Amino acid sequence: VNSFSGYLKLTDNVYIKNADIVEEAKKVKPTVVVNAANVYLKHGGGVAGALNKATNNAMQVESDDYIATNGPLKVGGSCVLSGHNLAKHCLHVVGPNVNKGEDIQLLKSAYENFNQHEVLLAPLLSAGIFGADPIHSLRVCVDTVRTNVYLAVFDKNLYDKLVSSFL
Numbered sequence: 101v102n103s104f105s106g107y108l109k110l111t112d113n114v115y116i117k118n119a120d121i122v123e124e125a126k127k128v129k130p131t132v133v134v135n136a137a138n139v140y141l142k143h144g145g146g147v148a149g150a151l152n153k154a155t156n157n158a159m160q161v162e163s164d165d166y167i168a169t170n171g172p173l174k175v176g177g178s179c180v181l182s183g184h185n186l187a188k189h190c191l192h193v194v195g196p197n198v199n200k201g202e203d204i205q206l207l208k209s210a211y212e213n214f215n216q217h218e219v220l221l222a223p224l225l226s227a228g229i230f231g232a233d234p235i236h237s238l239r240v241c242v243d244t245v246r247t248n249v250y251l252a253v254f255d256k257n258l259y260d261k262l263v264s265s266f267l
């Protein structure tokens with residue numbers, strides 16, 4: 101039993117809700133919140149910009165130190181950093197950005213990072229400003245993640261479409 105409330109159950113291990121991941125994180129304080137990161141951990145917009153803003157830029161300060169030490173992530177890769185006031189940990193995961201020409205096949209590799217954590221709160225990778233089809237992202241999530249994932253979908257219209265079209 102966990103503290104996630106109001107989710108629709110899609111499969112044995114995947115749950116979905118129309119919610120703002122920022123507000124959901126602040127309420128649940130999950131062990132792991134997933135960020136829709138880029139390889140530079142520059143959290144300017146989309147989910148990343150929103151999460152970083154909620155940490156009062158502490159996420160960005162920590163991220164800049166991480167990059168200065170380690171260099172950029174790989175597309176499809178991840179790193180674990182602090183969750184600040186939102187969660188114990190933040191798993192920064194880089195899905196391919198279609199608006200940069202990146203290989204959509206890397207989306208499965210991106211979701212594989214979730215399997216290193218028993219329970220996560222997460223957005224749909226590569227959705228939103230990353231330019232991928234959120235319906236496809238949900239399919240890859242369901243077919244790749246085996247741990248317990250709670251998906252927050254900000255747009256109510258998109259949420260309804262994701263539920264109504266789910267096979």
Ligand SMILES: O=C1C[C@H]2CCC[C@@H](CN1)N2c1ncnc2[nH]c(Cl)cc12
Nearest residue numbers: 120121150223227228229252253254255
């Ligand atoms: O539902 C979506 C899809 C998903 C990936 C693309 C960017 C946005 C757009 N809307 N996003 C979010 N997901 C969950 N929480 C969110 N909070 C804020 Cl602000 C945005 C946001």
